[PDB]
Amino acid sequence: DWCNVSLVDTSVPEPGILEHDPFFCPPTEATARDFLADALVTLLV
Amino acid sequence: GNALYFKSARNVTVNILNDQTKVLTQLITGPKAVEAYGKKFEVKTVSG
Ligand SMILES: *[C@@H]1O[C@H](CO)[C@@H](O[C@@H]2O[C@H](CO)[C@@H](O[C@@H]3O[C@H](CO)[C@@H](O)[C@H](O)[C@@H]3O)[C@H](O)[C@H]2NC(C)=O)[C@H](O)[C@H]1NC(C)=O
Ligand SMILES: *[C@@H]1O[C@H](CO)[C@@H](O[C@@H]2O[C@H](CO)[C@@H](O[C@@H]3O[C@H](CO)[C@@H](O)[C@H](O)[C@@H]3O)[C@H](O)[C@H]2NC(C)=O)[C@H](O)[C@H]1NC(C)=O
Ligand SMILES: *[C@@H]1O[C@H](CO)[C@@H](O)[C@H](O)[C@H]1NC(C)=O
Numbered sequence A: 001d002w003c004n005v006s007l008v009d010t011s012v013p014e015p016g017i018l019e020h021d022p023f024f025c026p027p028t029e030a031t032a033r034d035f036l037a038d039a040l041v042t043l044l045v
Numbered sequence B: 001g002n003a004l005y006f007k008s009a010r011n012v013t014v015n016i017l018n019d020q021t022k023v024l025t026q027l028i029t030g031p032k033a034v035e036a037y038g039k040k041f042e043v044k045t046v047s048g
Helices: A037-044
Strands: B012-017 B023-029 B034-037
Touching: none
Parallel strands: none
Antiparallel strands: B012 B023, B023 B034
């Protein structure tokens, strides 16, 4: 059938990260103190 | 007018304890995986 003869040639058909930033959540930094020496002073006076 | 948050620098290990302080169901939202341990799961709609 010559009517459905198809010819095709070459053509030019030419058509991940994860991150979220919150603002802050710092813990108790510099965790050290004492309430004896000052108590000793104010109970030694 | 505000959004209640929960944050940490590490895992959020939501869990449940029985009277013997033993874990039955758990929901650990970690950095990479969101695990839901337990004896089941469900998703329902409003009508049931
Ligand atoms: C879940 O709830 C929170 C709090 O209601 C929603 O956050 C709100 O998001 C809107 C839309 O961006 C913020 O409005 C605008 O935000 C920009 C910053 O992106 C700011 O520059 C503008 O001036 C304006 O405020 C709103 O501020 C923000 N609220 C808070 C407290 O941060 C969030 O959108 C809700 N989730 C969904 C899916 O709607
Ligand atoms: C915070 O959550 C993450 C994500 O769920 C946890 O990471 C996972 O932790 C499990 C248990 O520690 C790891 O299983 C381990 O596998 C090794 C073999 O790879 C095995 O030898 C160990 O005995 C244990 O079964 C799993 O690999 C690990 N996965 C990833 C991607 O990190 C993490 O442990 C949680 N941390 C805390 C403090 O809850
Ligand atoms: C190609 O074949 C189909 C199916 O038989 C037919 O419908 C169509 O008319 C044919 N095309 C031509 C140009 O004859």
